[PDB]
Write a protein that binds this DNA or RNA. Structure first.
Ligand SMILES: [Zn+2]
Lengths: 219, 150, 481, 351, 352
DNA sequence: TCTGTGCAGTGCTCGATGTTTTATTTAT
């Protein structure tokens, strides 16, 4: 049995990116690999130019994300999408200089009434220990948020720690149970995969490599 | 669980002239709470259950326009209220707007005035179902049915 | 040289590290490769390049040989034989005929490499939302790929710059294989069909240049001149030394940092029979008109199964499959067929949206079929509203509410897809599809109300609104089995 | 603790404070019910462009950054990538005893060092360098005189920042503001009477509007604020934070305010320190029902929620609350402030 | 203090002072309760079209979209000062539309016009072509002194107060005005369930029944009116007027906000009621008192007394909680107390 | 000891222009 660090990602608004080079900023259904690394990298004091420990975090940690349905008054509330018409005045026209446009337009998608429970474990050749990752989520250095800085948390990042055989068995200890799980480690009775391009290329800033979740449906 | 709309329709139809007149002179739905004849009419339809009270007030207040103003006609969904008001060819579209925009109690007052004018032929259990909820959705569908008929 | 030296970004089919191979290593081994770039649109551009290359160097003489080369890699001797007469046309840095370029471009300034990076620039918001310096130094492979992408999939740089033969932003549709080698071979028309496809000047635009302001009959263009068509006057600059490519992140001896361009126009009359794109068939007057498919006001896509969505739209909605797809169906009518596909949604030079499915079942078809049904129900209802809005002499965005709502349809329903796909199996299929219907039914009502909400308390529009909502529920009722 | 949480409940009269590209009020689904929304970016700009901000943040004492005093630490920071010849040449041409240095200052100067290092190698100087880097030099000089604004709100949409360390986030994080209650918006059907037209108007239109008791949430990263102020003190950071508390209570977006005029101050302001910053939005996840207004039940729902989860969420730490209302108070663990100024002083004094 | 906040509590007898597309009373949800509403645009038009405005401020602007009709008005009004050719080109440059002899020429949208301002412009146009100065450079010159243009708004003050935008012509660049007065929609301090009047029209040639039967919504209500004036903005909008000039204009707004009532349905409902409480307060930041009535006022010997009381209590709560100490005065019929409105107005005229 | 015409040097606004769109219409 390995040690797991259990996290809770809850808030009225979330955003988990999909590939884009456009003014449209799309969200997926559950947290990304890159987004979870960034969240951890925020709790730790990692700066954007520190590629060394940026790569040390990525090589040390793997995730498992469970989608949690909001239950209210014994009624189920579904996750909905939200489109924000987001404008910027005096936005940069070039990457150097002070010339700017009057108005630019962007379109940003959010999730509403979404909540997630994240299982976290160490790779066989990890650098850090779950003990110091626990410290980081309890006392973050940079401000933690759900995808975008405008999206605060309504529940503490830290949920618990535990020991278990597989990520599914670990997430079982924490209500609410029943949601679909996406894991970096495969579990025995499941064979479905979820393709994604959310593996941050750390040697190539703001670029992403293809990878795959192992899909584990809830009962 | 659900109000027997036709049973209530029949009960109102074979009501004695006295009890009928006592109910008809009401000027708004809440005044039915002052009428003894009203309680006896709706008691076998679940009045003592608070769940049914607001619905029964609307239903009976619409009926109170008269025994012969609302003519029930069986399905061939069945004729909705919106289509039935348009079928009369007597009601201006502007009065339908004013009806569906009106707030509480005032809406029932204006509705009953429209029923009096239109003397509609409709599916009464279908109208009762509409009166049970009477949400914003039902009011918009009323107006759209009226318009789609004309 | 694209036929000789390494430039193809690959990694093992289920392996790890990226390695840069050459065309011979691909054609002459049972090694399983898959393209690997940071961008899906560039992976598709690369495959298109490879396919167009394999289309001129090795068309099978018959279907029998076609099936043979797929199961059996060529020998290095056969490969060298086939590529021998083509080496002269695939030089990046060359004296008189650079690959897809034009020597002697008259330009006052040097155009940055980002302009070939399709979407990194193009709109006034790009500098604010995108990461800078993606095109400071491009390797040889990425440069050729980018050039090929600009000539085929991307819109022109701006005024005075022309787009590809299929038009601006066409949808490219390839038959998918098990690995890169098979996929390339699978999309090469055999010699017989090649002749039936193209019944001319068969020399490239960078060897036999295009004359300014000339009118060109489409039938007067050879298949290699068309497949490797270059509508723009572009000339690369002198590259630089060893370092990281700012696009792919790989090390490269030569890295380009800029290029020259100039306004250049002409006219291709008629429609060139490009084999890589599906098209729409319309009959105006007595003549038959064809239009290559493109993501116009929406880009139909779902996570994990976008290729299936696009496939069904072609299969069902006057759409016709690509010629390379038509070939595969004839060669193997009973074999299952999935797409490798991509395209852009654009506002002239600006790229608004990218949708690409690049990876190397009947329930999924059923799911997509159901999805498109609700999509169509929504469109007919809101088009009914938009037309009535127009006929009522009203102005504003009310005349296109069916466009926005269609885009929102795919994005809102995409959120349902992961859970649907996760629970699909033999016994649960009918149940999860039924639940999907209820969800999509509810979504259509929500989106209808949302699209129409800004025009509440417009009494003159009540008959238009009522007709539109009645239309919606009529089509929604026809969808429940 | 490192984080300051700021919670505001503010009631607006009929208005349209934030709208989209169809001129409809912005909204959000929360707890399955529609809430009117004022976006993060709208709220933050109302603060950043306000007069109060220009006077207390834009004209701060820590505003100015002197490259002269930073020579030593810059000399050792860039000393392993660059030698003092270039580092000092750069430091002087940009301007014409410091302990620490702001991260973006190091990174942007390091970029200028890369340019002059390549300038000496390419064997060009005089005006040629100052011609090429004319706009770039002008850019950083402006930024060196807006240090508190940059530390608090982050860099501007056009800043001329060049490096990754130049991607400067704000030390304060502002959430989207949403109503505590469900809202069905009203519609204003309007005319425009033409002075030269006899029959009817020259234009007709509609405008969506509503009231709303909004919940505003913001947090401040103190260490980040200090670190981006060249290593300022906790006290100096707490002084900045006092201004944020004031603005989140009083500043309102200007949209539609000329014709709807919803110039309302907050009725409840609460500040609490923590190691983990949390929004108390789930106090209203079950949408607040009206009982003699929405404001009183909202403050009540906010207080009851705090009493229920604060302990388990680790919201032990200094907490204070200001309120215009006499609603039954939170747990006694929260110190009641009778005026806003007393609340702000409580923040200056570290709680 | 740059802002002058104005607070009015005014009670109306049964009436229908402002209605919508279906002739029903305008309303709004505030505190979860329906309030009867009078739009700010209705208030502003009632003031600018009033006799008091005409006597104390001057001429209201000309708001129109019909340039062909405007063309003819200017020719009749500016004919003895300029030749018809100059008048036509001036309108053409400002509106961005071709002014010929067409029966119908339409602007982009409804736009407020000031004759005196147009008169000032055609001077420039005349001098422009006289000095052989083309239109592109004429615009460049005029953009250099917008204050000289804004001095003409002293002939059209309602624009200086309420603003102007244009999307075509030189008005895009030269006529952009951000109004100095902010004003809210008047809402009732209490919940209202509107009354309905069931009426008939008796036909003198019809002995049986009436020729028309109908219904008309109406109600009473104690309304809260709020407005503020940005003095510095008002001075700038008047081409650099003095504070005394701005203060005097503000004083007329105070008077009108307390006495001017929209004319709608007044011929048959006659709710000609003056305000029962007026409150003026100088501040650095605009302050509305609306949240005094977020909890809807319950009746207690009327709505008026408990409304004024609710206003006073909330005023103290805000002043004590936010430590506000801007000058303030209060006139009432039911903080410096003013026995008469006139004393209140002198107070404002004298910078508080 | 300040200032004047030439620059060099360029920061621009100017305008014509590359492309390409359409899908519907209740219930009685
Ligand atoms: Zn590369």
């Amino acid at each position: 049995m390995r040690s797991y660090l259990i996290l809770r990602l809850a808030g009225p608004m979330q955003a988990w990116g999909q590939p884009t080079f456009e003014g449209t900023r799309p969200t997926g259904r559950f947290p990304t690999r890159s987004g979870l690394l960034g969240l951890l990298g925020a709790c730790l004091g990692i700066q954007r130019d520190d590629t060394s420990s940026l790569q040390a975090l990525s090589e040390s940690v793997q995730f498992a994300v469970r989608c949690d349905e909001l239950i209210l008054d014994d009624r189920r509330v579904s996750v909905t999408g939200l489109r924000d018409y987001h404008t910027v005045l005096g936005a940069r026209e070039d990457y150097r200089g002070l010339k700017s446009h009057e108005t630019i337009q962007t379109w940003r998608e959010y999730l509403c009434d979404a909540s997630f429970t994240v299982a976290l474990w160490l790779t066989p050749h990890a650098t850090m220990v779950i003990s110091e990752l626990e410290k980081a989520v309890l006392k973050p250095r940079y401000t933690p948020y759900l995808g975008r800085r405008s999206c605060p948390l309504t529940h503490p990042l830290f949920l618990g720690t535990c020991q278990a055989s597989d990520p599914q068995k670990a997430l079982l200890n924490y209500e609410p149970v029943g949601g679909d799980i996406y894991s970096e480690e495969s579990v025995t009775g499941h064979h479905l995969k979820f393709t994604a391009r959310d593996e941050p290329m750390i040697t190539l800033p703001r670029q992403f490599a293809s990878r795959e979740w192992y899909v584990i449906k809830g009962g | 669980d659900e109000i027997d709309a036709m049973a209530l329709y029949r009960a109102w139809q074979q009501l004695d002239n006295g009890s009928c007149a006592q109910i008809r002179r009401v000027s708004e739905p809440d005044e039915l709470r002052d009428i003894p004849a009203f309680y006896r009419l709706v008691q076998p339809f679940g009045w003592e259950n608070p769940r049914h009270q607001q619905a029964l007030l609307r239903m009976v207040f619409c009926l109170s326009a008269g025994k012969n103003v609302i003519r029930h006609q069986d399905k061939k969904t069945g004729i909705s209220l919106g289509r039935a008001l348009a079928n009369s060819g007597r009601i201006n579209e502007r009065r339908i707007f004013q009806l569906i925009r009106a707030d509480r109690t005032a809406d029932m007052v204006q509705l009953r005035r429209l029923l009096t004018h239109a003397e509609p032929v409709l599916d009464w259990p279908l109208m009762a179902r509409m009166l049970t909820w009477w949400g914003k959705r039902e009011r918009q569908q009323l107006l759209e049915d009226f318009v789609l008929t004309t | 040289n694209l036929l000789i030296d390494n430039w193809i970004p690959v990694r093992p089919r289920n392996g790890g590290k990226v390695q840069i191979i050459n065309l011979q290593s691909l054609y002459c081994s049972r090694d399983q490769w898959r393209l690997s770039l940071p961008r899906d649109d560039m992976e598709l551009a690369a495959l298109a390049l490879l396919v167009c290359i394999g289309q001129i160097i090795a068309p099978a003489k018959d279907d029998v040989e076609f099936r043979h080369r797929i199961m059996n890699p060529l020998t290095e001797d056969e490969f060298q034989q086939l590529i021998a007469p083509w080496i002269d046309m695939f030089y990046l840095n060359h004296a008189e005929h650079p690959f897809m370029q034009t020597k002697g471009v008259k330009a006052n300034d040097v155009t940055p490499m980002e302009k070939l990076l399709a979407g990194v620039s193009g709109a006034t918001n790009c500098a604010f939302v995108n990461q800078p310096g993606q095109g400071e130094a491009l390797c040889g492979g990425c440069t050729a790929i980018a050039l090929f992408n600009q000539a085929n999939q991307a819109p022109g740089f701006g005024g005075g710059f022309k787009s590809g033969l299929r038009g601006g932003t066409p949808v490219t549709t390839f038959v998918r294989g098990i690995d890169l080698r098979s996929t390339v071979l699978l999309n090469v028309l055999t010699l017989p069909r090649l002749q039936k496809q193209f019944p001319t000047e068969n020399q490239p635009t960078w060897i036999k240049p295009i004359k300014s302001n000339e009118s060109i009959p489409a039938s007067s263009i050879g298949f290699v001149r068309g497949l490797f068509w270059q509508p723009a006057h572009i000339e690369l600059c002198d590259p630089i030394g060893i370092g990281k490519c700012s696009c792919c992140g790989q090390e490269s001896n030569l890295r380009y940092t800029g290029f020259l361009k100039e306004k250049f126009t002409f006219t291709v009359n008629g429609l060139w029979p490009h084999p890589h794109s599906p098209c729409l068939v319309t009959v105006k007057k007595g003549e038959v008109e064809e239009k290559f498919l493109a993501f116009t006001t929406s880009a139909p896509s779902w996570t994990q199964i976008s290729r299936v969505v696009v496939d069904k739209i072609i299969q069902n909605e006057g759409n016709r499959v690509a010629a390379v797809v038509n070939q595969f169906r004839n060669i193997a009518p009973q074999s299952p067929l999935e797409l490798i596909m991509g395209g852009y949604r654009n506002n002239q030079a600006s790229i608004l949206e990218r949708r690409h499915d690049v990876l190397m079942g009947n329930v999924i078809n059923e799911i997509v079929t159901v999805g498109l049904g609700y999509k169509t129900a929504l469109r007919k209802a809101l088009y009914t509203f938009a037309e009535g809005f127009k006929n009522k002499d009203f102005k504003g965005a009310g005349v296109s509410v069916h466009e926005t709502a269609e885009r929102h349809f795919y994005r809102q329903s995409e959120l349902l897809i992961p859970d649907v796909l996760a629970n699909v199996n033999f016994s649960q299929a009918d149940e999860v599809i039924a639940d999907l219907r209820d969800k999509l039914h509810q979504l259509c009502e929500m989106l209808f109300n949302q699209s129409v909400a800004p025009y509440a308390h417009h009494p003159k529009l009540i008959s238009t609104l009522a007709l539109a909502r009645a239309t919606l529920y009529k089509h929604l009722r026809e969808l429940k089995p | 603790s490192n984080f300051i949480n700021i919670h505001v409940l503010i009631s607006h009269s009929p208005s349209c404070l934030n709208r989209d590209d169809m001129n409809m009020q912005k909204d959000a689904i929360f707890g399955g019910k529609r809430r009117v929304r004022i976006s993060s970016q709208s709220l933050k700009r109302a603060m950043r462009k306000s007069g109060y901000y220009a006077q207390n943040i834009g004209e701060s004492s820590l505003r100015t950054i002197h490259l002269a005093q930073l020579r030593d630490v810059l000399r050792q920071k860039l000393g392993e990538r660059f030698d003092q010849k270039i580092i000092d040449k750069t430091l002087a041409l940009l301007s014409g005893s410091a302990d620490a240095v702001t991260p973006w200052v190091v990174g942007e100067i390091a970029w200028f060092c890369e340019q002059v290092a390549k300038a000496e190698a390419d064997n060009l100087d005089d005006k040629k360098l100052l011609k090429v880097l004319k706009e770039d030099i002008a850019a950083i000089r402006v930024n060196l005189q807006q240090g508190v604004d940059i530390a608090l709100s982050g860099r501007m949409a056009t800043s001329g920042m060049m490096t990754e360390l130049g991607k400067v986030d704000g030390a304060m994080s502002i959430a989207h503001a949403i109503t505590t209650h469900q809202v069905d918006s009203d519609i204003d059907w309007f005319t425009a009477v033409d002075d030269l037209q006899e029959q009817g108007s020259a234009h007709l239109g509609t405008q969506e509007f509503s009231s709303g008791v909004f919940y505003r949430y913001a947090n401040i990263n103190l260490a980040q604020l200090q670190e981006n102020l060249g290593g300022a003190s906790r006290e100096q950071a707490l002084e900045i934070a006092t201004h944020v508390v004031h603005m989140l209570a009083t500043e309102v977006p200007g949209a539609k305010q000329r014709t709807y005029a919803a110039f309302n101050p907050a009725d409840m302001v609460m500040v609490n320190f923590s190691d983990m910053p949390l929004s108390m939005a789930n106090a209203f996840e079950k949408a607040v029902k009206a009982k003699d207004g929405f404001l009183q039940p909202s403050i009540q729902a906010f207080n009851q929620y705090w009493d229920r989860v604060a302990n388990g969420y680790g919201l032990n730490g200094a907490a204070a609350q200001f309120s215009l209302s006499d609603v039954d108070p939170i747990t006694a663990q929260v110190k009641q402030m009778p005026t806003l100024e007393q609340l702000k002083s409580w923040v200056r004094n570290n709680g």
